[PDB]
Write an enzyme that holds these catalytic residues in place. Structure first.
Site, PDB file in Angstrom:
ATOM      1  N   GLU A   1       0.781  -1.127   0.173  1.00  0.00           N
ATOM      2  CA  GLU A   1      -0.096  -0.071   0.097  1.00  0.00           C
ATOM      3  C   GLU A   1       0.922   1.213  -0.056  1.00  0.00           C
ATOM      4  OE1 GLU A   1      -2.740   1.182  -0.540  1.00  0.00           O
ATOM      5  OE2 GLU A   1      -4.013  -0.640  -0.944  1.00  0.00           O
ATOM      6  N   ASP A   2       1.555   1.269  -0.976  1.00  0.00           N
ATOM      7  CA  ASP A   2       2.477   2.653  -1.334  1.00  0.00           C
ATOM      8  C   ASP A   2       3.280   3.042  -0.249  1.00  0.00           C
ATOM      9  OD1 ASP A   2       0.709   3.185  -3.365  1.00  0.00           O
ATOM     10  OD2 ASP A   2      -0.624   4.139  -2.234  1.00  0.00           O
ATOM     11  N   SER A   3       3.839   1.855   0.314  1.00  0.00           N
ATOM     12  CA  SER A   3       5.010   2.052   1.379  1.00  0.00           C
ATOM     13  C   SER A   3       6.438   1.480   0.564  1.00  0.00           C
ATOM     14  CB  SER A   3       4.659   1.242   2.663  1.00  0.00           C
ATOM     15  OG  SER A   3       5.952   1.209   3.519  1.00  0.00           O
TER      16      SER A   3
ATOM     17  N   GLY B   1       5.812   7.117  -1.261  1.00  0.00           N
ATOM     18  CA  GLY B   1       5.144   6.147  -0.363  1.00  0.00           C
ATOM     19  C   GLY B   1       6.278   6.690   1.001  1.00  0.00           C
TER      20      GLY B   1
END
Ligand SMILES: [Mg+2]
Ligand SMILES: [Zn+2]
Ligand SMILES: [Zn+2]
Ligand SMILES: [Zn+2]
Lengths: 48, 67, 404, 260, 51, 484, 46, 115
Positions: free
Chosen positions: F173-175, F314
């Site tokens: 999730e966009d990390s 991120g």
RNA sequence: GACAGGUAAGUAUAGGGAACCCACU
């Protein structure tokens, strides 16, 4: 005399190089302020 | 601003290579040739050298706060 | 602690949590709970409220705790589910031909928290012991829930034809007595959709059991994904030259059809359809032609996709993307639209100064005939920017409208 | 039910790297050895710095960071040295630390390059790698006239796990099953994957036929040293440290069981 | 209808698969700044005295 | 105020520009031939929008080239280069024509946020807030346009080996996972400069302010913070460590523990660093006026924001040491790992192309060219070049799990890519409160973390709690925990 | 007591006393800087 | 500000047991060894050695949380055998492996040096 | 008178607000 496409890439980029060397990036700001100071102030004073 | 001491990825010392790299470049080696001569095989180190921008000269252009 | 993310849209936007203190300087969330919060880790910040009295603490513990909030009354279906890497990994894991060695099963088993401590008989004994992802997932599944779903790629005719209960593609899911008998899990079987496996788990077993279920799925599948590996790259965007040629032929034929329609309309041979002026009819014909071309090209690209293709992996697992997305990446991007119409004549009978006047062709009116991989010619890029701007504006206005 | 019989072959050996192969051992053992190379080999590096004066364009933290990153010859002195934390001396002592002093001043119009040459050690056996006796000295900072940099530093023992500066290696290439006999990976298009250097296959062939009974053996290592230690020293110290950790774990386990 | 409130923290969120869905990781600094009132009883008197 | 852009003039079907013009421009330094000379010669001409309405224009001389079915055959101008339609921020994007436009829009702002060297002479400017990256780098993949944005002179970001793979799930999730060893080696380390300012005002003989090192016996309004760090002039000195709520400018005011009230300026709460430098002057009215610049070294850590040049941002989910990070057959390990789930929906194919060409250029010892509308560059050519350097033609590689050494069944896409660290760091956003200061008008908690404020339990939060039915918790949140 | 400040222009050291108008005795330049502290300062090389 | 000290990874805090033993009540002959300030290196080597051991019905390790530096090793042996004995023997065999590899590496390095 | 050294006596070692702008999710 003409510019073949292979040359044309470098040619257009040289053109852009010269443009930016001449103008800069904030040329619009500088020119507007210079024109203001040079002309508009005197124009206002006289019009008063 | 200055050449990093180590390659971020692998940690190979590169800080002692910037001046030699510039010397080769003015000696007309291509960048790849200069990197090979310095021995930077891994493209991590090759990146470390290629992408570096030595801003320290521009910084030194200014006079020190103290004489 | 109550945990919140503005905007608070529904009940699940604020949910209770048990605190665990770990070194660094952020709130660490489990990936599943992101969906109810509608939160992503792109920099989103969240608030935390500490109840100060035993009464409030009990209230939260008995009412707002995430396990109790698992299923929303809004649509009588679960709000969280397996997402992202976990979803793709479970889809890959539950494939028919996934086999695990003693050590791999070893690691996954101990990561499974609710494990009873008994290693199951491997699905294969000779010439060498081997388990299956289905076996391990059966261990993961709690209780003895029974469920039937269908993998996303499940052909419809299979249900009628032979092999009905023995899927050649394994695209039918059947959990019996809390054991994944057969099928490839996906979003259909593990997401928020009604009748999903998580939904049935919540309904049958306790909310706490479903909580443990979520945690075990995530941990075990992530640990297996460490071995399995999952990526995306230019290889997954490339297609074979044959499919490239097919797409080019389709686009050329569609362009020729549009040219024929334009010539007919100019000759006046075209006639209006009922309830539509002639110009509306012409626009409808053009749009239909281009949409059909885009659909055919997307179908061709999806066909060309290989089983190893990561875009197809992800779309099939339902974690992210869409067949439309793959079509845009591989084949043509498609028509750009502003206000539900082709690019308007901003100039004098011209979309851009680079076209002759009164040009209604696909390129002139802003049809992107190039895939994202192929790049966009400047005019197509400009038109695509127009479309994106339309989308952004719609978002920025609907936010306030819906808030009010 | 018992240990393997690992064998070794050194296929190459230079002052800057060692390439070898270990056969008849577990992938777990090989990977742990690699990890110990990277992280848990003791080394001496600057970790204490006091900036008496710094006129340079760079700030004190920047300079200290670079000094720490500088590598120091630690071939034998590290072994004698004890970890500063273990050491009894109040502040610092030879048994637990090595002192350095730097003092430069640009009194000329040309830029003065403060390199690792200027790093003056107390113990001759420990010095900047480049200063050893062609490789140039590691630049630290450049000074225009009117600038100065005076500082006193101490380097102590430590391993990469605590901080990357103690990490001795500068690239530990690790490999096994060059041909994909074990099929641990899966090439969708094996033909388009370049052969490994250790690959032993005909050009027409892409990968070895699958071996159902195979197991990872013959792990190929190529450990490049950062000049802090000779690569052979790195490997030997890593093995010694791993054995030390296992022995300490055995001692703790014995104590625990005896208490139980 | 809306107010600012004490005993409320705010910070960026990062993923952590190793947490139960009902758990939440919190920085030690935030935990230290936050306090929950606990009444003294013979049961917990020793623990609170140690605290 | 009438906008206008240059355009190459076209007569019949030929440019007025000529090889001689190009050569003169090449030698502009010596012969002094210039863009103004071009304009005077009349090859190029300015055009505004109204005139554009009538102008008939061509992408490139290729359009002028005769064709079996002449489309226009009556051109009047030609673009200098299509890429010029972009702006400053959009220009730094490599391969923008391979991205979904909204991602280009996002990058237009994330670039503004990127940290770098905002100005060469930063060492003297006492700017209120500033961020300076330790080791900026010009991107390995560059649009020709950045030559004029001077991104080379003042790059904002680092080229980093990025592997687009799922690894332990901490990048979901966009990390993004980050190499702790790289961070130790200075990867993306930066410094944050904050400038405080103060002045002693002599507005009135009755009441005047003065910088000094106040003492409890004389001045009254002293916190428990120690003033020893100050000097005899009420000013801290450079090279002095400082923590939050630590007096840095000892100031006092003459009253109408006696005859002196403390008006000192403390360091912002929760902050820390070292006093970079101090400047003392007189304001317009001769009053003593001191500015203090304090620098804090920000090491990238969990929660810090990073972003590529392709709308992909991120937060650092977690940092793994080098031994933990996966590695190629070579010792190479990714500086950053980003979840593949970003790309599918985002359509940041430009990101992948940038990574590929970055690998190519790094191996080749050159700077890749990602000018948008450049037919001479395409994925197939880049892949062939990459394969020439003994790599998989699509950039994939065989990576080994760091923890176990075992190969990874999949082959990970990996390569150099230009990343950039945005100013928003978790350290500047973390905030918490338990019975802090309250507003004067209403006794509710103050606002803003700089004031040790409290978070807003807003109307929708009230409504969500109502739905939950937690009447007692709602009562506590709105009454007993806010302003009983 | 001494309070040596470095002038911006001439980079000259000069004492300044409290209540003393800020102006370099040497060049009349109104911008000065405090000299680097003498306090012990250390930096772990991390 | 919240960054843990680097040494915390490997330095036992005051009063920390290096290793702790528990009995997994779910099944017999099963022990859990919680080892502090250790990581995948030791976990993996020990797991591999125990798996090599035939009497071991069960051997493996895991890291409960990466941000924490603790590992848990679960080992189940046959009734006629102890998980503690299996663990000790695995460590002993790994130590012998390291000793043999060390001496062979010394020999190889020497021989390469001479030629 | 000044200045340098020593002895004795006394002193010194409670918190803003508004407005606006920018930027962020
Ligand atoms: Mg977000
Ligand atoms: Zn490197
Ligand atoms: Zn000592
Ligand atoms: Zn002066």
């Amino acid at each position: 005399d003409e510019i073949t496409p292979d040359l044309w890439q470098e040619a257009c980029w040289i053109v852009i190089s010269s443009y930016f060397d001449e103008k800069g990036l904030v040329r619009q700001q500088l020119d507007s302020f210079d024109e203001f100071i040079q002309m508009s102030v005197q124009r206002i004073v006289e019009d008063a | 601003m200055i050449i990093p001491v180590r390659c971020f990825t692998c940690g190979k010392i590169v800080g002692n290579k910037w001046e030699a790299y510039l010397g080769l470049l003015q000696a007309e080696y291509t960048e790849g040739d200069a990197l090979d001569a310095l021995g930077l095989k891994r493209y991590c180190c090759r990146r470390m050298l290629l992408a570096h921008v030595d801003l320290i000269e521009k910084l030194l252009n200014y006079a020190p706060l103290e004489k | 602690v109550i945990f919140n993310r503005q905007p608070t849209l529904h009940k699940m936007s604020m949910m209770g949590h048990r605190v665990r203190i770990l070194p660094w300087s952020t709130f660490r969330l489990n990936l599943s709970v992101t969906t109810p919060y509608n939160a992503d880790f792109d920099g989103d910040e969240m608030n935390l409220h500490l109840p100060q009295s035993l009464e409030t603490r009990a209230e939260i513990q008995e009412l707002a705790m995430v396990p109790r909030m698992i299923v929303t009354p809004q649509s009588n279906r679960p709000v969280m589910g397996i997402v992202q890497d976990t979803l793709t990994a479970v889809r890959k894991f539950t494939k028919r031909d996934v086999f695990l060695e003693r050590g791999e099963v070893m690691n996954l088993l101990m990561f499974l928290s609710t494990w009873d401590g008994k290693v199951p008989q491997p699905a294969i004994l000779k010439p060498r012991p081997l388990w299956t992802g289905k076996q391990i997932f059966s261990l993961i599944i709690p209780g003895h829930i029974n469920c039937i779903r269908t993998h996303s790629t499940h052909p419809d005719d299979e249900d009628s034809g032979p092999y009905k209960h023995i899927s050649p593609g394994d695209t039918k899911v059947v959990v019996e007595n809390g054991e994944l008998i057969m099928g490839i899990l996906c979003k259909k079987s593990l997401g928020t959709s009604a009748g999903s496996l998580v939904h049935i788990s919540y309904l049958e077993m306790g909310h706490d059991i479903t909580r443990l279920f979520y945690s075990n799925i995530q941990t075990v599948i992530n640990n297996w994904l460490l071995i399995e590996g999952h990526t995306i790259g230019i290889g997954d965007s490339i297609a074979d030259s044959k499919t490239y040629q097919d797409i080019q032929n389709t686009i050329k034929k569609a362009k020729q059809d549009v040219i024929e329609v334009i010539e007919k309309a100019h000759n006046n041979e075209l006639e209006p359809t009922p309830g539509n002026t002639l110009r509306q009819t012409f626009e409808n014909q053009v749009n239909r032609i281009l949409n059909d071309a885009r659909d055919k090209t997307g179908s061709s690209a999806q066909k060309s996709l290989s089983e190893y293709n990561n875009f197809k992996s992800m779309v099939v697992s339902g974690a992210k993307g869409s067949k439309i997305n793959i079509s845009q990446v591989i084949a043509v991007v498609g028509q750009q639209n502003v206000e539900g119409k082709r690019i308007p004549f901003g100039f004098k009978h011209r979309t851009l100064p680079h076209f002759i006047k009164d040009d209604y062709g696909p390129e002139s009116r802003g049809f992107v005939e190039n895939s994202y991989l192929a790049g966009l010619t400047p005019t197509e890029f400009f038109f695509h920017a127009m479309g994106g701007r339309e989308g952004l504006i719609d978002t920025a206005v609907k936010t306030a409208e819906t808030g009010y | 039910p018992y240990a393997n019989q690992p064998t070794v072959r050194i296929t190459e050996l230079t002052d800057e790297n060692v390439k070898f192969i270990i056969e008849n051992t577990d992938l777990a053992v090989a990977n742990s050895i690699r990890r110990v190379f990277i992280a848990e080999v003791p080394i001496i590096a600057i970790d204490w710095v006091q900036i008496d004066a710094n006129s340079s364009v760079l700030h004190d933290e920047f300079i200290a960071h670079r000094l720490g990153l500088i590598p120091l010859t630690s071939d034998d002195i590290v072994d004698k040295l004890q970890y500063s934390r273990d050491c009894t001396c109040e502040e610092f002592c030879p048994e637990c630390s090595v002192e350095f002093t730097l003092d430069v001043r640009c009194n000329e119009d040309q830029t003065r390059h403060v390199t690792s040459r200027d790093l003056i050690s107390n113990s001759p056996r420990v010095i900047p790698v480049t200063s050893r006796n062609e490789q140039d000295d590691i630049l630290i900072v450049k000074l225009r006239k009117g600038q100065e940099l005076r500082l006193r530093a101490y380097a102590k023992k430590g391993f990469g796990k605590e901080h990357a500066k103690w990490n001795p290696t500068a690239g530990v290439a690790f490999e096994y099953d060059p041909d994909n006999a074990l099929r641990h990976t899966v090439y969708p298009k094996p033909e388009e994957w370049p052969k490994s250097e250790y690959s032993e296959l005909d050009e027409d062939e892409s990968q070895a036929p699958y071996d159902p009974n195979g197991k990872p053996e013959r792990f190929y290592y190529n450990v490049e040293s950062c000049g802090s230690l000779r690569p052979e020293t790195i490997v030997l110290s890593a093995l010694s440290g791993l054995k030390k950790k296992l022995s300490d774990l055995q001692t703790q386990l014995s104590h625990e069981i005896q208490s139980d | 209808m809306g107010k600012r409130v004490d005993f409320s923290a705010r910070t960026v969120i990062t993923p952590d698969p190793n947490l139960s869905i009902d758990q939440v990781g919190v920085p030690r600094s935030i935990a230290a700044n936050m306090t929950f009132a606990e009444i003294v009883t013979p049961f917990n008197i020793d623990r609170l005295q140690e605290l | 105020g009438r906008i206008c852009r240059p355009l190459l003039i076209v007569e019949k079907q030929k440019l007025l520009l000529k090889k001689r013009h190009i050569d003169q421009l090449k030698e502009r330094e010596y012969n002094n031939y210039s863009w103004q000379d071009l304009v005077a010669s009349g090859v190029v001409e300015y055009i505004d929008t109204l005139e554009e309405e009538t102008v008939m224009l061509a992408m490139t001389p290729d359009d002028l080239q005769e064709k079996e079915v002449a489309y226009c055959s009556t051109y009047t101008h030609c673009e200098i280069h299509p890429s010029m339609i972009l702006g400053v921020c959009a220009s730094i994007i490599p391969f923008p024509d391979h991205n979904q436009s909204p991602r280009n829009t996002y990058q237009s702002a994330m670039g503004k946020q990127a940290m770098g060297v905002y100005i060469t002479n930063f060492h003297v400017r006492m700017d209120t807030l500033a961020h300076v990256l330790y080791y900026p780098q010009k991107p390995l993949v560059t649009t020709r346009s950045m030559e004029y944005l001077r991104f080379r002179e003042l790059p904002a970001g680092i080229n980093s080996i990025v592997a687009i793979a799922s690894y332990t799930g901490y990048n979901q999730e966009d990390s993004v996972i980050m190499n702790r060893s790289a961070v130790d080696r200075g990867f993306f380390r930066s410094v944050f400069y904050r400038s405080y300012k103060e002045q002693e005002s002599k507005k009135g003989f009755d009441q005047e302010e003065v910088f000094e090192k106040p003492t409890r016996e004389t001045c009254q309004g002293m916190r428990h913070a120690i003033y020893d760090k100050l000097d005899d002039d009420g000013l801290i000195a450079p090279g002095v460590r400082v923590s939050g709520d630590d007096v840095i400018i000892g100031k006092t005011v003459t009253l109408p523990r006696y005859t002196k009230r403390d008006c000192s300026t403390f360091l912002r709460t929760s902050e820390t660093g070292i006093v970079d430098q101090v400047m003392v002057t007189l304001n317009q009215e001769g009053y003593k006026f001191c500015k203090i610049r304090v620098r804090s070294v920000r090491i990238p850590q969990i929660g810090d924001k990073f972003a590529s040049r392709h709308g992909q941002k991120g937060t650092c989910g977690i940092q793994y040491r080098q031994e933990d990070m996966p590695f190629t057959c070579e010792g190479i390990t990714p500086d950053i790992i980003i979840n593949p789930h970003a790309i599918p929906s985002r359509m940041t194919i430009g990101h992948l192309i940038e990574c590929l060409q970055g690998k190519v250029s790094a191996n080749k010892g050159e700077i890749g060219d990602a000018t948008p509308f450049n037919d001479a560059v395409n994925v197939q050519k880049i892949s062939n070049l990459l394969s020439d350097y003994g790599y998989h033609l699509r950039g994939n590689e065989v990576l080994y799990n760091g923890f176990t050494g075992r190969k990874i069944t999949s082959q990970i896409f990996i390569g150099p890519t230009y990343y950039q660290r945005l100013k928003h760091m978790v350290d500047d956003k973390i905030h918490s409160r338990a019975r802090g200061p309250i507003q004067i008008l209403n006794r509710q908690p103050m606002e803003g973390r700089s004031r040790d404020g409290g978070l807003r339990f807003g109307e929708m939060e009230r409504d969500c709690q109502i739905a939950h039915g937690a009447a007692q918790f709602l009562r506590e949140r709105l009454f007993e925990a806010s302003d009983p | 007591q001494p309070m040596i400040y470095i002038c911006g222009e001439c980079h000259t050291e000069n004492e300044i006393k409290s209540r003393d108008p800020i102006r370099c005795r040497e060049c009349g330049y109104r911008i000065m800087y405090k000299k680097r502290t003498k306090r012990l300062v250390v930096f772990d090389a991390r | 500000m919240n960054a843990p000290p680097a040494f915390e990874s490997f330095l036992l805090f005051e009063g920390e047991k290096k290793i702790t033993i528990n009995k997994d009540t779910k099944v017999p002959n099963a022990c859990l060894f919680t080892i502090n300030k250790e990581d995948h290196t030791l976990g993996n080597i020990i797991k591999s050695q125990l798996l090599k051991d035939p009497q071991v019905l069960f051997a493996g390790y895991k890291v409960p949380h990466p941000l924490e530096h603790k590992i848990i090793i679960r080992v189940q042996t046959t009734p006629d055998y102890s998980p503690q004995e299996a663990f000790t023997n695995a460590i002993t065999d790994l130590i012998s492996e390291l000793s043999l590899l060390e001496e062979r590496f010394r020999v190889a390095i020497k021989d390469k040096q001479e030629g």
